[PDB]
Amino acid sequence: GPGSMAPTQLEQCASHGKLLQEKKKLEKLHLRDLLKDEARNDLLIRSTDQGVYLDFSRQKITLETLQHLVNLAHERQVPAMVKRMFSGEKINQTENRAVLHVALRMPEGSEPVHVDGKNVLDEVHAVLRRIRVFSEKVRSGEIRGHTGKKLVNVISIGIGGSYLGTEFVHLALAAEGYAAEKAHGRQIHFLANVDPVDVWLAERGFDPEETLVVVISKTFTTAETMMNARSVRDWYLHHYKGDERALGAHFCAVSTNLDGTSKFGIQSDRVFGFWDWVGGRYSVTSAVGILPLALQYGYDVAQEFLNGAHAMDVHFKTAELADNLPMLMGLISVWNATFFGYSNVAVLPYAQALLRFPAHIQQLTMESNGKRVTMDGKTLDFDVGEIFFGEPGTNGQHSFYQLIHQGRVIPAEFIGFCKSQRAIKLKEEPVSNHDELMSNFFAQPDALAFGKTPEELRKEGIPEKLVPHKTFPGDRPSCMLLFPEISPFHIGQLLALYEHRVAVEGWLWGINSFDQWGVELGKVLAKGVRGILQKRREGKAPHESGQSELCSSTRKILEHYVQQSK
Amino acid sequence: QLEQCASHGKLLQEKKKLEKLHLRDLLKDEARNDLLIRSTDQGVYLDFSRQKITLETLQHLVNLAHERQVPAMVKRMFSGEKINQTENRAVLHVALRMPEGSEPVHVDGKNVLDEVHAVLRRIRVFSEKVRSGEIRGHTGKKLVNVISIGIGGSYLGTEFVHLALAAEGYAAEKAHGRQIHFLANVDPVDVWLAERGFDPEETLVVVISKTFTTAETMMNARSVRDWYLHHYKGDERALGAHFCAVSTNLDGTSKFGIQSDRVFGFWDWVGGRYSVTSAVGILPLALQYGYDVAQEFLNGAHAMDVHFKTAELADNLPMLMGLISVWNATFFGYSNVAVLPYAQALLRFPAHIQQLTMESNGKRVTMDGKTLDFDVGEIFFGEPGTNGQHSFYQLIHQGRVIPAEFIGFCKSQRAIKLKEEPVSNHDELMSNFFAQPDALAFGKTPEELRKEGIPEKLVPHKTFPGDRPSCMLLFPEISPFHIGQLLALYEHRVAVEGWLWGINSFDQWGVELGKVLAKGVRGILQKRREGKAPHESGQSELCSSTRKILEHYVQQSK
Ligand SMILES: O=C[C@H](O)[C@@H](O)[C@H](O)[C@H](O)COP(=O)(O)O
């Protein structure tokens, strides 16, 4: 429009009209009835040859509805978008960039991927080799701190995409048998917030002489990160009594901005770079995640994580639409959000290891698809990206599941694993602790689908006064994803699965999943407030500070703040 | 009921008027903004000017609260009436923090405060003795680690308060050398994580469960007991010195092997999600930080309680916050609220509020069982600022509208100011706190974008519609007292919304179905592990989907 990548807007697509009718048909049918159809149920399961099992039977779809959804994906040219992504076309059109997180995990010997005439895999693997060598030396003690001590602590400084994914993976692997051994004696703190309390927390229990600082920022100008980096710098200067020469041995960086890293005093043999075609929220498989993960766990664990994400990439670019797990989860979510109007998705990993997975998926989803215009700048007449949130199970069952069962409908995504990282089976116990865990994983989706009717409650002998309070309407959709175990490889697969599903949804809608213009205004306005606060702290009057140009509310609360802080 | 109130009709018309107007125009009105601020004498500053209301609308909101008898309900709550009618229970979390010498509050002819203060005195003495070493582990070592076992209401509030206090100057000194792990999930990885780095001989276990029958918590307690038995070479006699409990079920605590001098009880009228000011929270907080810190926390909750009980409707912060939320959710249809504290100390505050709000008001019937004609409780989520700005604010600014609640503090627990630096690190943090609400309210039009040289190509992409609402709350500092005030503010705001809607904020029947069905799957799994075939295990009665995925699971874990 003209030359747009997928010109049939969602409402123009042939299957859109058809899918609106399906919605009218399917809203009359309860999940408890649809699930009586085993032939249907059976054809809404997919199971890959590398261990990914997905069940999407608890969705308001017939096989007919699914066929319309697949047709819609074709009409929106989603398979063609996948090829453009993989061949390195600049599909991030508002920033004129490629979108090549997938290149980060293509193995050496893969088919070249060209961006402006250069095969980007050459630089991808050159950085991976350097991380491998560097992580090996730090871990062995070949590289030491300024006073000759082994570096056994890491402060990884970074916000948003520069830590959420990494912290997800870090915690996912912490209790893994092999990873734990390799991390033995080693610690990593994530310094994210500009709140100086987070600086204090990152420093706690760390001797600077045994500590390595990793400064992680794409631009190397992010306000919080650079402030944190200078503050940690100052902590070293206090420790080393002002001797600047002591700093170089304790600092390294991950960025796309080598002028920035140099000006900060970190030389290129301590910078492990990445590229503009790696979005922050898609950066964990670049040096952003691979360096800190390699430092904590060794390069081998980090490599297996990359191989798993690659496995899921190959699936995404080669599986037929109807067998393609990311396409499928993308279609189901667009169906729930756009056609059924459900604004939220609950991300529910039945794994304490995945404590911070929902937090990473929240950025990945919301920052990608929380948009209001198409790639080509047309205003959408409808809300697009869902609100994602979550906590691991069973925890969440005692927090917000009350609402998911009896309140607002929230489509749920249950994620589980067949084997435990740290199995327990007590002799007196009927079941292993993992089986107890998983009894919940299997029971919750059926509870959401089937519910419990007043009729059943009466037969159970519930008094009539309490029947409405104990009614479970059901009809609440869910997907169940189940992997063999929490290995680096399956963590990579799960990551890549969600990375691609987010892409699929963005392409279904015609938006740009890969820019984030929505964060700019806050940054600009906060810089203005910074200036005002500086002037007041310097002793300038309100008429002198610039605050008089702000609205009356902000005027008054600033003044309260200055008065309470002076 | 709600729709029958005179002010409901009036508020339906206000909504039609207000959706045609933009906050950028409303906020030009300084007299208006000025009346949309409250500031208490214990330091809580609330600004709700960035809301789609005029002073007329607000009057209508205040009237709706009277029409729904929100003030009479407060009085019923505080006097110990059984206002949780589906369970026939009083709702007396405010009793937990009434100071010694407060007027009696009766349930079933008994002044509940006698029991409230008796447990508090026993926690003070017990915590003093553990912390000083007058009470030791079985081998005589000072106890310096706590494994607090508990799920849901039995830990989320406690972990919120714990992390909020961790970096406080005085609390940190009191916590120095002391560690606490929260064992919540039945996932045995959480057991391994709880036990990690703790020598059992220096570790105290607090088992926390209102019923003392929750599946996860009891299995956890049994698993930790086993860990103790293996350390101590099967010697039962060693366990007593390492265990204590918080529960309403003393038959269950005894039967577990914990005697009454190591049980610190609470009561049926304390909801789980309102329990952190009972023994649930007060014992582990007192253990970690010493009792004085726990008491100051209680005193802060109590200050806000008195405010809730006495402030006139229009000056009453919980009522105001609850009214504004219903305005957004019920009248404007916004289903979510973002809870956004500009404080790393409040890392787990959103997670606690998520339970408090959603488990309370995620309901579909009124107190007396009438089906509601509309959705009620909002979906709450959040992360601290500034973290969240680099995670999901993109959507809050340009995507779906999500009413936001910004929480900040005037002073830092760990102030840094660098010589080379224009502002202190806290001021940098706070620059964002002050900027974001105005970014949301005013936005940035295409016209302004053109004036700044943005090419016409990018103008749509860089447009911010604005008109997105927010509240700003500012306290003096992250002290135990202000943490208490913040907690009680939210407990009461949730209660306000419940009463406006006509629901029971205080039951949670919604969790039973998953528990009953999980117990059945447990039995099927046992039978499969024991070698019963698929047709012999009970599996045959489940839907096909579950039968298949269960068999996959057994195959893959055989
Ligand atoms: O997708 C990422 C977004 O652009 C942004 O939210 C980013 O993740 C963080 O701000 C970190 O930015 P730097 O890596 O540039 O510091």
Ligand SMILES: O=C[C@H](O)[C@@H](O)[C@H](O)[C@H](O)COP(=O)(O)O
């Ligand atoms: O308000 C809380 C709810 O009742 C529920 O979330 C409860 O908090 C947990 O299920 C733990 O209950 P116990 O304390 O009985 O283990």
Ligand SMILES: [Cl-]
């Ligand atoms: Cl996904």
